Amino acid sequence: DSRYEHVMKLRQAALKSARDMWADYILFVDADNLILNPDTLSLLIAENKTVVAPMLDSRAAYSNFWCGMTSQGYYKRTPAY
Amino acid sequence: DSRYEHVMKLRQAALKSARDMWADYILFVDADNLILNPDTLSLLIAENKTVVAPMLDSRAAYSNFWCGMTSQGYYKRTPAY
Protein backbone atom coordinates (compact mmCIF):
# COMPACT_ATOMS: atom_id res chain seq x y z
CA ASP A 1 0.00 0.00 0.00
CA SER A 2 2.97 2.34 0.44
CA ARG A 3 3.71 1.92 -3.27
CA TYR A 4 0.12 2.77 -4.20
CA GLU A 5 0.28 5.85 -1.97
CA HIS A 6 3.58 6.96 -3.50
CA VAL A 7 2.34 6.51 -7.08
CA MET A 8 -0.84 8.46 -6.31
CA LYS A 9 1.07 11.31 -4.67
CA LEU A 10 3.63 11.51 -7.47
CA ARG A 11 1.02 11.62 -10.23
CA GLN A 12 -0.95 14.22 -8.28
CA ALA A 13 2.20 16.34 -8.01
CA ALA A 14 2.74 15.98 -11.76
CA LEU A 15 -0.80 17.17 -12.46
CA LYS A 16 -0.35 20.11 -10.09
CA SER A 17 2.90 21.00 -11.85
CA ALA A 18 1.12 20.92 -15.21
CA ARG A 19 -1.52 23.43 -14.09
CA ASP A 20 0.89 26.16 -12.98
CA MET A 21 2.77 26.15 -16.30
CA TRP A 22 -0.48 26.93 -18.19
CA ALA A 23 -0.18 23.87 -20.41
CA ASP A 24 -2.84 22.21 -22.51
CA TYR A 25 -2.86 18.42 -22.27
CA ILE A 26 -0.66 16.13 -20.18
CA LEU A 27 0.31 12.84 -21.81
CA PHE A 28 1.22 10.17 -19.25
CA VAL A 29 3.58 7.66 -20.90
CA ASP A 30 4.95 4.96 -18.60
CA ALA A 31 8.03 2.73 -18.59
CA ASP A 32 7.32 -0.01 -21.13
CA ASN A 33 4.54 1.52 -23.26
CA LEU A 34 6.35 1.60 -26.61
CA ILE A 35 4.58 4.44 -28.46
CA LEU A 36 5.56 3.31 -31.94
CA ASN A 37 3.50 5.39 -34.37
CA PRO A 38 5.01 8.91 -34.62
CA ASP A 39 1.61 10.61 -35.10
CA THR A 40 0.07 9.49 -31.80
CA LEU A 41 0.01 12.94 -30.18
CA SER A 42 -1.40 14.73 -33.22
CA LEU A 43 -4.15 12.15 -33.74
CA LEU A 44 -5.19 12.26 -30.08
CA ILE A 45 -5.09 16.07 -29.96
CA ALA A 46 -7.13 16.59 -33.12
CA GLU A 47 -10.10 14.69 -31.68
CA ASN A 48 -11.39 16.99 -28.91
CA LYS A 49 -12.34 14.77 -25.97
CA THR A 50 -11.54 15.32 -22.32
CA VAL A 51 -9.81 12.04 -21.38
CA VAL A 52 -8.83 9.90 -24.36
CA ALA A 53 -6.46 6.95 -24.37
CA PRO A 54 -5.28 4.98 -27.41
CA MET A 55 -5.69 1.22 -27.32
CA LEU A 56 -2.27 -0.42 -27.30
CA ASP A 57 -1.94 -3.99 -28.53
CA SER A 58 -0.34 -6.86 -26.62
CA ARG A 59 0.43 -10.54 -27.06
CA ALA A 60 -2.74 -11.75 -25.29
CA ALA A 61 -6.16 -10.41 -24.32
CA TYR A 62 -4.63 -7.80 -21.99
CA SER A 63 -4.99 -4.18 -23.03
CA ASN A 64 -5.51 -0.82 -21.39
CA PHE A 65 -9.27 -0.30 -21.14
CA TRP A 66 -11.98 -2.20 -19.28
CA CYS A 67 -15.63 -2.40 -20.25
CA GLY A 68 -17.38 -2.62 -16.88
CA MET A 69 -16.84 -2.59 -13.12
CA THR A 70 -19.16 -4.72 -11.02
CA SER A 71 -19.50 -3.44 -7.46
CA GLN A 72 -16.06 -2.65 -6.02
CA GLY A 73 -14.17 -1.93 -9.24
CA TYR A 74 -13.02 -5.24 -10.67
CA TYR A 75 -13.10 -6.52 -14.23
CA LYS A 76 -16.42 -7.74 -15.63
CA ARG A 77 -16.18 -8.70 -19.31
CA THR A 78 -19.08 -7.32 -21.39
CA PRO A 79 -19.62 -8.85 -24.84
CA ALA A 80 -18.62 -5.54 -26.45
CA TYR A 81 -14.96 -6.20 -25.64
CA ASP B 1 19.65 58.70 -24.73
CA SER B 2 20.75 56.73 -21.67
CA ARG B 3 17.13 56.32 -20.49
CA TYR B 4 15.81 54.80 -23.71
CA GLU B 5 18.28 51.93 -23.40
CA HIS B 6 16.77 51.29 -20.00
CA VAL B 7 13.24 51.38 -21.42
CA MET B 8 13.78 48.71 -24.09
CA LYS B 9 15.78 46.67 -21.58
CA LEU B 10 12.53 46.54 -19.58
CA ARG B 11 10.22 45.46 -22.41
CA GLN B 12 12.50 43.09 -24.31
CA ALA B 13 13.03 41.62 -20.84
CA ALA B 14 9.23 41.39 -20.43
CA LEU B 15 8.31 40.00 -23.85
CA LYS B 16 10.72 37.23 -22.83
CA SER B 17 9.04 36.42 -19.52
CA ALA B 18 5.74 35.98 -21.39
CA ARG B 19 7.24 33.52 -23.87
CA ASP B 20 8.73 31.13 -21.31
CA MET B 21 5.44 30.86 -19.43
CA TRP B 22 3.22 29.90 -22.40
CA ALA B 23 0.96 32.92 -22.03
CA ASP B 24 -1.31 34.09 -24.82
CA TYR B 25 -1.42 37.86 -25.28
CA ILE B 26 0.35 40.54 -23.27
CA LEU B 27 -1.15 43.89 -22.28
CA PHE B 28 1.36 46.74 -21.99
CA VAL B 29 -0.21 49.46 -19.86
CA ASP B 30 1.93 52.29 -18.53
CA ALA B 31 0.89 53.54 -15.12
CA ASP B 32 -0.50 56.79 -16.51
CA ASN B 33 -3.60 55.76 -18.51
CA LEU B 34 -7.10 55.39 -17.07
CA ILE B 35 -8.57 52.07 -18.22
CA LEU B 36 -12.20 53.02 -17.68
CA ASN B 37 -14.54 50.78 -19.67
CA PRO B 38 -14.30 47.45 -17.79
CA ASP B 39 -14.81 45.43 -20.99
CA THR B 40 -11.69 46.61 -22.81
CA LEU B 41 -9.79 43.33 -22.46
CA SER B 42 -12.56 41.09 -23.80
CA LEU B 43 -13.34 43.53 -26.61
CA LEU B 44 -9.66 43.57 -27.59
CA ILE B 45 -9.31 39.78 -27.39
CA ALA B 46 -12.40 39.08 -29.50
CA GLU B 47 -11.01 41.11 -32.42
CA ASN B 48 -8.38 38.54 -33.50
CA LYS B 49 -5.53 40.68 -34.82
CA THR B 50 -1.79 40.47 -34.28
CA VAL B 51 -1.14 43.87 -32.67
CA VAL B 52 -4.17 45.93 -31.66
CA ALA B 53 -4.48 49.01 -29.45
CA PRO B 54 -7.49 50.92 -28.10
CA MET B 55 -7.90 54.55 -29.12
CA LEU B 56 -7.83 56.41 -25.81
CA ASP B 57 -9.04 60.00 -25.58
CA SER B 58 -7.48 63.21 -24.31
CA ARG B 59 -8.20 66.90 -23.90
CA ALA B 60 -6.62 67.93 -27.20
CA ALA B 61 -6.07 66.30 -30.59
CA TYR B 62 -3.13 64.25 -29.29
CA SER B 63 -4.05 60.58 -29.09
CA ASN B 64 -1.96 57.41 -29.12
CA PHE B 65 -1.85 56.56 -32.84
CA TRP B 66 -0.21 58.39 -35.74
CA CYS B 67 -1.35 58.10 -39.33
CA GLY B 68 1.88 58.37 -41.34
CA MET B 69 5.67 58.35 -41.13
CA THR B 70 7.36 60.64 -43.64
CA SER B 71 10.97 59.56 -44.15
CA GLN B 72 12.59 59.48 -40.70
CA GLY B 73 9.63 58.31 -38.63
CA TYR B 74 8.28 61.65 -37.44
CA TYR B 75 4.67 62.75 -37.30
CA LYS B 76 2.77 63.77 -40.44
CA ARG B 77 -0.92 64.65 -40.16
CA THR B 78 -2.52 62.73 -42.99
CA PRO B 79 -5.96 64.25 -43.75
CA ALA B 80 -7.51 60.95 -42.62
CA TYR B 81 -6.80 61.77 -38.97
Swiss-Prot record, chains A, B:
Compartments in which it is found: Endoplasmic reticulum lumen
Disulphide-bridged cysteine pairs: none
Glycosylation: residue positions: 48
Result for mutant: residue 15 to R: In BSVD3; loss of galactosyltransferase activity
PTM per Swiss-Prot/TrEMBL: N-glycosylated.
Expressed in which tissues: Ubiquitous with higher levels in placenta, heart, lung and spleen.
Record family assignment: Belongs to the glycosyltransferase 25 family.
Function, as annotated: Beta-galactosyltransferase that transfers beta-galactose to hydroxylysine residues of type I collagen. By acting on collagen glycosylation, facilitates the formation of collagen triple helix. Also involved in the biosynthesis of collagen type IV.
Disease: Brain small vessel disease 3: An autosomal recessive form of brain small vessel disease, a cerebrovascular disorder with variable manifestations reflecting the location and severity of the vascular defect. BSVD3 patients may have disease onset in utero or early infancy with subsequent global developmental delay, spasticity, and porencephaly on brain imaging. Other patients may have normal or mildly delayed development with sudden onset of intracranial hemorrhage causing acute neurologic deterioration.
Protein name as it appears in the record: Procollagen galactosyltransferase 1
Source species: Homo sapiens
Protein's gene: COLGALT1
